[PDB]
Design a protein around this ligand. Structure first.
Ligand SMILES: [Cl-]
Length: 331
C-alpha cells in the first residue's frame, strides 16, 4: 500500500479490464513529465477496483469512478487516489452527471431507471423511470445538460435520446434514431452529437449501417446525418474545449468541424489494424489522446497527438482502456 501525492495537472485513464475477470485498473498520466503510473487505485488503497471501470468524473477535488460490473462508484481524493467513500446498490452503472453538490444522476445498463444520488451523503435518493423500457433490455448511457433539461442516449438494445426535466426528475420527451446510440456531446451551438454502433451480427435487436447525428437541443430534432457502412462499429463522440471540433472512432479516428456538411475524406488518425477504443481532447490545448485496446487482451496503449495530428507521446496503460478524465489546474 503506497503513498501518492501527484501533480495538480493530470489525466486519468480508466481500464475496463476483461468483462467477468475483475482486472479493471486506474491509470494516471502526467503530461508535463510524460510519465504514466498504472494500477494506482489498488496501489493507493490495498484493494482492487473490480470489473469494467467505465467512466470517471472529477468535481470539487474528488474523483468519481464508475465500476460498471461491480455495482459501485468509488470517490477518491484526486491527489492521493485514496477512497473517501463509495456508493453501492447500482444495478450496472455507466455514467455520472452532477446537477449539484447534493444531486447527481447515474445511468445504468439492464435497468430502466436512472438512479438519483446524493454525492455529499453517498446515498441513492431516487429513480427516474424510462418509458418503453424494461430491465432485461434496458440502457441509459451518457448525458448532457441543456438548461433545466438533461439529454441521455439509450445504448444497448435501444434507439432513443430521452429528455429529462431535472426540476421534476422525469422523462418529458424522446427522439427515435438509429439503433444503439453510443455517446453524447453538446457543441457550443447547443446542438447534440451522438454516433450509433450499428448493433452486431446475429443480434436479436438488429444490425445496420451506423450513423453520426447532429440534433438541435431546442427543437430536439435531427439536423444532420452521416451514415457509414454495415459492419462499421463507431463510438466515442468527443469535443475540443471550445466545443466546435468533433472527434469519434470508426476504425480510424475522425475529426470534423461541428459546422461542416461532410465528413472529411482523410481521418485524424489512420486505422492500423488494432482497436481504437477510448478517446479524449485536452480542453485547454486541443491535444488528442487515443486509447488503443489492441486485441482486448494485452496491455493497452495511449497515443498522444497534437491538434495538428503529430504524435507527441505514447504510454502503456491497463487492459481495454476505454475512458479518460482530465484533472486540470486551470480551465
Ligand atoms: Cl487500479
Amino acid at each position: 500500500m503506497e503513498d501518492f501525492s501527484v501533480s495538480a495537472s493530470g489525466l486519468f485513464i480508466t481500464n475496463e479490464g476483461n468483462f467477468q475477470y475483475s482486472n479493471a485498473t486506474l491509470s494516471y498520466y502526467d503530461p508535463a513529465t510524460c510519465e504514466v503510473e498504472n494500477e494506482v487505485f489498488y496501489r493507493a488503497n490495498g484493494f482492487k477496483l473490480g470489473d469494467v471501470a467505465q467512466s470517471m468524473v472529477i468535481r470539487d477535488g474528488i474523483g468519481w469512478i464508475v465500476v460498471n460490473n461491480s455495482h459501485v462508484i468509488f470517490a477518491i481524493d484526486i491527489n492521493t487516489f485514496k477512497e473517501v467513500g463509495r456508493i453501492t446498490g447500482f444495478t450496472s452503472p455507466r455514467y455520472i452527471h452532477f446537477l449539484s453538490d447534493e444531486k447527481a444522476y447515474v445511468t445504468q445498463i439492464w435497468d430502466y431507471r436512472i438512479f438519483i444520488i446524493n454525492p455529499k451523503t453517498y446515498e441513492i435518493t431516487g429513480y427516474i423511470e424510462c418509458p418503453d423500457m424494461d430491465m432485461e433490455s434496458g440502457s441509459t448511457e451518457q448525458m448532457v445538460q441543456y438548461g433545466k433539461y438533461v439529454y441521455v442516449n439509450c445504448w444497448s438494445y435501444q434507439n432513443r435520446i430521452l429528455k429529462i426535466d431535472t426540476e421534476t426528475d422525469k422523462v418529458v420527451d424522446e427522439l427515435t434514431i438509429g439503433i444503439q446510440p453510443t455517446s453524447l456531446v453538446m457543441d457550443k451551438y447547443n446542438k447534440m452529437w451522438t454516433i450509433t454502433d450499428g448493433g452486431y451480427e446475429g443480434s436479436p435487436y438488429g444490425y445496420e449501417a451506423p450513423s453520426l447525428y447532429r440534433i438541435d437541443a431546442e427543437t430536439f430534432t435531427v439536423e444532420k446525418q452521416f451514415k457509414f457502412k454495415l459492419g462499421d462499429w463507431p463510438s466515442e463522440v468527443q469535443l475540443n474545449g471550445t466545443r466546435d471540433t468533433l472527434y469519434w472512432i470508426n476504425n480510424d479516428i475522425w475529426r470534423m468541424p461541428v459546422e461542416a456538411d461532410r465528413v472529411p475524406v482523410r481521418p485524424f488518425l489512420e486505422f492500423r489494424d488494432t482497436k481504437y477504443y477510448g478517446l479524449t481532447v485536452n480542453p485547454n490545448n486541443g491535444e488528442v489522446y487515443v486509447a488503443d485496446a489492441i486485441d482486448y487482451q494485452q496491455q493497452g496503449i495511449v497515443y498522444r497527438y497534437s491538434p495538428q495530428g503529430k504524435l507527441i507521446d505514447e504510454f502503456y496503460v491497463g487492459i481495454i482502456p476505454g475512458a479518460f478524465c482530465w484533472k486540470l489546474e486551470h480551465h
